[PDB]
Design an enzyme around this catalytic site. Structure first.
Site, short mmCIF file in Angstrom:
data_model
loop_
_atom_site.label_atom_id
_atom_site.label_comp_id
_atom_site.label_asym_id
_atom_site.label_seq_id
_atom_site.Cartn_x
_atom_site.Cartn_y
_atom_site.Cartn_z
N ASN A 158 -5.89 -8.81 63.98
CA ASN A 158 -5.13 -7.62 64.32
C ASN A 158 -4.49 -7.13 63.03
OD1 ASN A 158 -4.09 -5.58 66.06
ND2 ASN A 158 -2.17 -6.76 66.30
N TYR A 184 2.30 6.21 65.32
CA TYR A 184 2.74 4.89 65.70
C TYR A 184 4.11 4.67 65.10
CZ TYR A 184 3.03 -0.20 65.57
OH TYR A 184 3.46 -1.50 65.66
N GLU A 230 8.05 0.10 70.95
CA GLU A 230 6.86 0.38 70.17
C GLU A 230 6.13 1.53 70.86
OE1 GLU A 230 3.77 -2.62 70.26
OE2 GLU A 230 3.40 -2.37 68.14
N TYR A 273 2.96 4.72 70.72
CA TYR A 273 1.68 5.18 70.25
C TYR A 273 1.36 6.56 70.79
CZ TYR A 273 0.18 0.31 69.24
OH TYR A 273 0.02 -1.00 68.77
N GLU A 281 -5.28 1.00 63.31
CA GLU A 281 -5.10 -0.36 63.89
C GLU A 281 -6.45 -0.89 64.37
OE1 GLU A 281 -1.98 -0.86 66.88
OE2 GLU A 281 -2.68 -2.90 67.31
#
Ligand code: NA
Length: 191
Positions: free
Chosen positions: A44, A76, A85, A87, A176
């Site tokens: 990741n 992000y 978090e 997105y 990502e």
């Protein structure tokens, strides 16, 4: 081998590159607001350029994004108090990352409908260390790799669904990857 994780200022922009050390990942800051990533069977990673702190701003992005498997190109970022978090996914590969969340509805912004999801991450890496926190998702239906994202429209739509944002931490146009290969080459700006 991976580029070492690192953060900070480059050519007047904030950047962050982070990985779990898996596979092969090469992150490269370029001139101005540009960066690239090439990766092979990564674990990741998340990397890109933007601003710290984030804001309700219009973010311009352009370039290439070529995932082979699961990878995302997103606005992000993070807030604190509460820790969130978030997105705004402009393109993805073979995996729609809303699969992992709960579908809450839609928002139209910048030429496309987006699907909105909330997920909970339990004891996951964060800007505050290992933590449990909400994840907000807006997932563009009409995938693209250049244009302008009005982050305030997404902040608004999330708030219409009862999703509160905290104080803004960083905000980047992130590439990502998760257990995939691919590349990207992206430039960011704000007017
Ligand atoms: Na917090």
């Amino acid at each position: 081998s991976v580029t070492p994780s690192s953060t900070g200022t480059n050519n007047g922009y904030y950047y962050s590159f982070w990985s779990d050390g898996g596979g092969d990942v090469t992150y490269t800051n370029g001139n101005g607001g540009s960066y690239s990533v090439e990766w092979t069977n990564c674990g990741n990673f998340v990397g890109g350029k933007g601003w710290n702190p984030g804001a309700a701003r219009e973010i311009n992005f352009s370039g290439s994004f070529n995932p082979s498997g699961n990878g995302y190109l997103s606005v992000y970022g993070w807030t604190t108090n509460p820790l969130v978090e978030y997105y705004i996914v402009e393109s993805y590969g073979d995996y729609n990352p809303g699969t992992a969340g709960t579908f809450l509805g839609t928002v139209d912004s910048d030429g496309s409908t987006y699907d909105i999801y909330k997920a909970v991450r339990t004891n996951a890496p964060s800007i505050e260390g290992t933590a449990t926190f909400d994840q907000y998702w807006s997932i563009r239906r009409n995938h693209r790799t250049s244009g302008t994202v009005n982050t305030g429209n997404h902040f608004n739509a999330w708030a219409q669904h009862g999703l509160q944002l905290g104080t803004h931490n960083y905000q980047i146009v992130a590439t990502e990857g998760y257990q995939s290969s691919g590349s990207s080459s992206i430039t960011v700006s704000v007017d």
